[PDB]
Design a protein around this ligand. Structure first.
Ligand code: TA1
Ligand code: GTP
Ligand code: GDP
Ligand code: MG
Ligand code: ZN
Lengths: 412, 426, 328
């Protein structure tokens, strides 16, 4: 029934504070109500301290807030091996203490930021130790993969080719939200050249609410978490659908709000609205889980999708007749009281596996090689209990992820 | 996390008074007084530089290493001079002779054990140590000789904790000493092989940046030092604040050193406007990157326009959009694709604190690892050979128990260090 | 010229045979092994020569060492690198008992005859060193002292003026006792009793050749032959010890990274310049002369058919492959 969550890395914790904010906000549970159902991990105290100092302060137990006062380090190795090791036991202990207290759970919604130190490396082993301790569950990891041109860390690809290879054999379904391709939504679909990180987090904080929150909530067409990985992954690679939201309208500027289903659904497949710089440049969809919420007639959907199934410029995979999981919820979305989000009475949080990430992975893999080709910042991981092995042998890993996402599509 | 500053020599000392003059106001610490802090955030992280004893007396956790009494006796007899616990003053009333050999082998070598004693009292303070800040000049006895020894010992006691070095590399045009390249070539040698982050500052690169970028007509030393101390506060202490994307000495190290030599950077501050008039507030952000990435405004002597970058770290500290930050950095990376090296897809390390330098709206420290600093260790290494050939003032070194092979060693090492840095300019 | 690379697969012990696990390496022929697993890459790799399990200490020695003796006589620097995982065969190939003389004793016996033959044609004199490398420190094995101060020659070239190689040998007997002291002298972590690792270490011979007619003086041939027993890398995850074991393993890996930068650089510098950074480590600095121009070099990668050797062998072979592969 339930789904724990493990917000790892500063960013996975900032997004975590935001997804966690939107929750109580649509459940009538002010600052001090019930009890959360998650944990927070970081090797930099000052960030989890922002959850201990700032808003939502007493909504957590100091027991679901793990910190390693030591050092974060923007390197996978250190955060996986060397340092992040010391904390893992303690970390696990909470996702085994919080996993026991419940009643027949379904999995752990992991929140991490691919190209970090604590977000790449640590989670790599956290998810690692989970796939063994609870191989009988769901492991849906919600990632914030590397911006396509606007990366931060100098090494980013080293950290994100290493979180992918280690988690790949361990996740069930990896949601992906690209940090930069969200900013385009903040520029183009909301109008603001002032997007604080606090906003991208409200936005993932929205799409995510559509995933767990409202879907684990009753509705006219409920969709369990297992339902996702079933209806969403064609193959055992921990396949990485993309998140998209529909009524991303501005709560100030334009106002057509009343944008019946027939519109909000078409607004998902336009590439300028998908929280991912994986514009459907060729990538055939292979399965989409259209989660609706609010006032939606099942015929409006079983027609608004029918129109789409016959657009053909949306080309689905060959071996897939029908790849449209319609999930209908009741309660409309719930916007921040005065952020910048419109506030409609219906939305579409469509997510999907697309052959499109054949790109995004390629462009992120090629990055890695350019630096590994010169060893760049290699001495920073080797000196942290890694080897020429784990790099070169995690490169070969994703190589068969460029071929996998090529073979499962492009061919008939 | 924590650090323990080190005031080696007079210059590194004189600067210590300016580094601590600043930082303390950036932390509301009056002379012996406590946290008057205008806020409450300038205190949750102070531990990085201080210690709890009384309850109003957070003492700076530095070391004052000098063979010349009158110096530390000017820093201790002036303004904030009465905040250092007397235990910090590791004096050497000996002759502080201007010889690198006199402060590294003969006269400094005695005072060292009475230093290491305290560097351990302060490291074993509490919590977890990060590293040590080191200030000094590469142009004197107590600076380049004794201060380079202090580190060669520190890096044997804690090869885990980092080592930032703030060196006052010998300024080109005029040398404020004569043997200068001797004291220098010999300390850079030790630096390339112990510290792992160096921030080289030039008394004349400052004068320029302080007489034309501040219309300041009478740039006293107190000013140069003040400007420098403004950067080393945007580096360390700063990132020991919150931020949308914070780093810390390691992130700065682990993003900025592609190759283990250590590599030396070139710091640059952001809002560098003359007082009254120029308070243009053209600080939206494109104005800070405009600033930091120009030639002039690099506290180094060399001009970045003369050589690629390997890494950059714009350590901003002032509320700004993670879009207009992460964006600007890009166009900067593409307008100047020429000088930025290519085998690093993203040279730049964007870093973003929240709280800005007390009285300002928005700043950003710049920490450039350009290959342009090749054209300085060249300079130093030249001045060496031109005089080493004739053994100029060498009898002051050998006559202090030195070696004719020791000078050879350092020059060649630091001269190879030039070579290597070119391997990436190409 | 090029550095030679070879691989040696050991033979599974009895205990592993009982396990009867799948074989990760298959040797097709003298030149080429295949990397498993077979129901992967399935990339065949061609070496020059493969050493079987079968080869004891006669065959291994003679093949690799014999062509270095010819370059030895030239008096160009020769070098042999021996690698191995724990239980790879490390001792067996390099040494064995007196009973089955491996490379070292057969160099000692054959090259002792080499000293006899060479000495006859030109008077020769030889000495040998056993140097270590622990915590980035050189320690003479024959006397433990503080590490040698490093200096450079005027042109270039790193020297340790801690050079000693304490005592030369008139015959086999003296060296044999030194070999007992060798294992003790190397600084090892308190490992399992079965496994023992050096920190990092080497061995050197010194050739100074003078014609019979020529004095000492006049042109001399100077050769050095270095025989290297590289240490193994550590893993943080495998080790779990870390701490002092962590620091030693980081130091080994940094010396290994510098060597590998020179190695790949050497292949590129077949089209190369000064670019090859010898300076990156003390090992590579010691080796400045020896990796060498037209020096002769060989790498012996030791590996096992063992199951644990699966990872270790695959990683080392990929790297060995990179020495043959890497071109711009
Ligand atoms: C009325 C007003 O706004 O005055 C400003 C001011 O006029 C200007 C010109 C300041 C002024 O700085 C200088 O004139 C200066 C003098 C010697 C060396 C270097 C600089 C200022 O003195 C400096 C002072 O800086 C700070 O308060 C920061 O917190 C800074 N503090 C110190 O350097 C410091 C000075 C004395 C005692 C203790 C600390 C800082 C910067 C980085 C990291 C930590 C602290 C500021 C904003 C001003 C005055 C007061 C006029 C400027 O410098 C800085 C570092 O902010 C010079 O260009 C900038 C732009 C500022 O607008
Ligand atoms: N959407 C979103 N992305 C974020 C946020 N914070 C950081 N990121 C992104 O995630 C990456 C940053 O990871 P870091 O903050 O450096 O590191 P970390 O993963 O927290 O772990 P460490 O490296 O050990 O500190 C960059 O690609 C950022 O653009 C956030 O609040 N929201
Ligand atoms: N920026 C700066 N440079 C200084 C200061 N004092 C001396 N210097 C520089 O340091 C060099 C001289 O070395 P010095 O500090 O006297 O050596 P020491 O005192 O014997 O260790 C010259 O290049 C000076 O310009 C100072 O307070 N600030
Ligand atoms: Mg962090
Ligand atoms: Zn309307």
């Amino acid at each position: 029934r339930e789904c724990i969550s493990i917000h790892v890395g500063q960013a996975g914790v900032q997004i975590g504070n935001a997804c966690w904010e939107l929750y109580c906000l649509e459940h009538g549970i002010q600052p001090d109500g019930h009890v959360p159902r998650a944990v927070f991990v970081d090797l930099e105290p000052t960030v989890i301290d922002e959850v201990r100092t700032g808003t939502y302060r007493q909504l957590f137990h100091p027991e679901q807030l793990i910190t390693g006062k030591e050092d974060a380090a923007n390197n996978y190795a250190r955060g996986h091996y060397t340092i992040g090791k010391e904390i893992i036991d303690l970390v696990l202990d909470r996702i085994r203490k919080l996993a026991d207290q419940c009643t027949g759970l379904q999995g752990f919604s992991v929140f991490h930021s691919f190209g970090g130190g604590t977000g790449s490396g640590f989670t790599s082993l956290l998810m690692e130790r989970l796939s063994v301790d609870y191989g009988k569950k769901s492991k849906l990891e919600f990632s914030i993969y590397p911006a396509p041109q606007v990366s931060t860390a100098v090494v980013e690809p080293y950290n994100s080719i290493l979180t992918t290879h280690t988690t790949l054999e361990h996740s069930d379904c990896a949601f992906m939200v690209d940090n930069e391709a969200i900013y385009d939504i903040c520029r183009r679909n909301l109008d603001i050249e002032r997007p604080t990180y606090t906003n991208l987090n409200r936005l993932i904080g929205q799409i995510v609410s559509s995933i767990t929150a409202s879907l684990r909530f009753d509705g006219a067409l409920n969709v369990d978490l297992t339902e996702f990985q079933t209806n969403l992954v064609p193959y055992p690679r921990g396949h990485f659908p993309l998140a998209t939201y529909a009524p991303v309208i501005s709560a100030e500027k334009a106002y057509h709000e009343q944008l019946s289903v027939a519109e909000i659904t078409n607004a998902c497949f336009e590439p300028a609205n998908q929280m991912v710089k994986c514009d459907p440049r060729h990538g055939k969809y292979m399965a989409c889980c259209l989660l609706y919420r609010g006032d939606v007639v099942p015929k409006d959907v079983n027609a608004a999708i029918a129109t789409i199934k016959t657009k053909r410029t949306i080309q689905f995979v060959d071996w897939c007749p029908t790849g449209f999981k319609v999930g209908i919820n009741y309660e409309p979305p719930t916007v921040v009281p005065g952020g910048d989000l419109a506030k409609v009475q219906r939305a579409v949080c469509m997510l999907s596996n697309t052959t499109a990430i054949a790109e995004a992975w390629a462009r992120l893999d090629h990055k890695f090689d350019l630096m590994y080709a010169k060893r760049a910042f290699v001495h920073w991981y080797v000196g942290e209990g890694m080897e020429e092995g784990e790099f070169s042998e995690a490169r070969e890993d994703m190589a068969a992820l460029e071929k996998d996402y090529e073979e499962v599509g492009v061919d008939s | 996390r924590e650090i323990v500053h080190i005031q080696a020599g007079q210059c590194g000392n004189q600067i210590g008074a300016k580094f601590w003059e600043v930082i303390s106001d950036e932390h509301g610490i009056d002379p012996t007084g406590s946290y008057h802090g205008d806020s409450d955030l300038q205190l949750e992280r102070i531990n990085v530089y201080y210690n709890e004893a009384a309850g109003n007396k957070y003492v700076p956790r530095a070391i004052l290493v000098d063979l010349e009494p009158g110096t530390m006796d000017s820093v201790r007899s002036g303004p904030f001079g009465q905040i250092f616990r007397p235990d910090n003053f590791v004096f050497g009333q000996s002759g502080a002779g201007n010889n690198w050999a006199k402060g590294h082998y003969t006269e400094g070598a005695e005072l060292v054990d009475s230093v290491l004693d305290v560097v351990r009292k302060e490291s074993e303070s509490c919590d977890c140590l990060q590293g040590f800040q080191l200030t000094h000049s590469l142009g004197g006895g107590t600076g380049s000789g004794m201060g380079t020894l202090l580190i060669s010992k520190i890096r044997e006691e804690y090869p885990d904790r980092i080592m930032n070095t703030f060196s006052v590399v010998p300024s080109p045009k005029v040398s404020d000493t004569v043997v200068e390249p001797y004291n220098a070539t010999l300390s850079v040698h030790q630096l390339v092989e112990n510290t792992d982050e160096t921030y080289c500052i030039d008394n004349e690169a400052l004068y320029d940046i302080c007489f034309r970028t501040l219309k300041l007509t009478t740039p006293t030393y107190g000013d140069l030092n003040h400007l420098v101390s403004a950067t080393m506060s945007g580096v360390t202490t700063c990132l020991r604040f919150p931020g949308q994307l914070n780093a810390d000495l390691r992130k700065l190290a682990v993003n900025m050193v592609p190759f283990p030599r250590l590599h030396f950077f070139m710091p640059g501050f952001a809002p560098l406007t003359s007082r009254g008039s120029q308070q243009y507030r053209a600080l939206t952000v494109p104005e800070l990157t405009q600033q930091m990435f120009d030639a002039k405004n690099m506290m180094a002597a060399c001009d970045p326009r003369h050589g690629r970058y390997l890494t950059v770290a714009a350590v901003f500290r002032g509320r700004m959009s993670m879009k207009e930050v992460d964006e600007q950095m890009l166009n900067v990376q593409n307008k100047n694709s020429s000088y930025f090296v290519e085998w690093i897809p993203n040279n730049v390390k964007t870093a973003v604190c929240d709280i800005p330098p007390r009285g300002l709206k928005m700043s950003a420290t710049f920490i450039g690892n350009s290959t342009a600093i090749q054209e300085l260790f060249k300079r130093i290494s030249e001045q060496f050979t031109a005089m080493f050939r004739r053994k100029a003032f060498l009898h002051w070194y050998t006559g202090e128990g030195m070696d004719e092979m020791e000078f050879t060693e350092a020059e060649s090492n630091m001269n190879d260090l030039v070579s290597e840095y070119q391997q990436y300019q190409d | 010229h090029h550095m030679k690379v070879v691989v040696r697969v050991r033979p599974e012990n009895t205990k592993e045979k009982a396990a009867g696990f799948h074989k990760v390496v298959h040797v097709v022929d003298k030149h080429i092994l295949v990397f498993d697993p077979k129901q992967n890459k399935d990339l065949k790799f061609v070496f020059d020569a493969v050493f079987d399990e079968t080869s004891t200490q006669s065959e291994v020695f003679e093949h690799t060492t014999k062509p270095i003796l010819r370059s030895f006589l030239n008096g160009y620097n020769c070098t042999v690198l021996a690698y191995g995982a724990t239980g790879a065969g490390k001792t067996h190939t390099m040494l064995g008992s007196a009973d089955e003389p491996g490379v070292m004793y057969l160099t000692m016996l054959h090259l002792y005859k080499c000293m006899d033959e060479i000495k006859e044609e030109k008077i020769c004199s030889t000495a040998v060193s056993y140097l270590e490398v622990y915590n980035e420190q050189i320690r003479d094995l024959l006397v433990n002292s503080g590490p040698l101060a490093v200096r450079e020659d005027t042109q270039k070239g790193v020297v340790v003026h801690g050079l000693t190689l304490h005592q030369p040998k008139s015959s086999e007997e003296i060296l044999h006792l030194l070999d007992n002291g060798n294992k003790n002298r190397t600084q090892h972590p308190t490992d399992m009793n079965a496994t023992s690792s050096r920190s990092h270490a080497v061995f050197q011979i010194y050739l100074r050749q003078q014609d019979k007619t020529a004095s000492i003086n006049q042109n001399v041939r100077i050769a050095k032959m270095s025989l290297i027993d590289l240490a193994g890398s550590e893993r943080a995850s495998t080790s779990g010890a870390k701490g002092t074991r962590f620091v030693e393993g980081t130091n080994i890996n940094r010396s290994l990274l510098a060597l590998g930068n020179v190695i790949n650089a050497l292949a590129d510098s077949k089209r190369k310049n000064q670019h090859i950074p010898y300076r990156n480590s003390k090992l590579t600095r010691l080796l400045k002369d020896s990796l060498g121009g037209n020096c002769q070099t060989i790498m012996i990668a030791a590996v096992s058919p063992s199951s644990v050797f699966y990872d270790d062998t695959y990683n080392t072979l990929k790297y060995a492959n990179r020495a043959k592969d890497i071109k711009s």
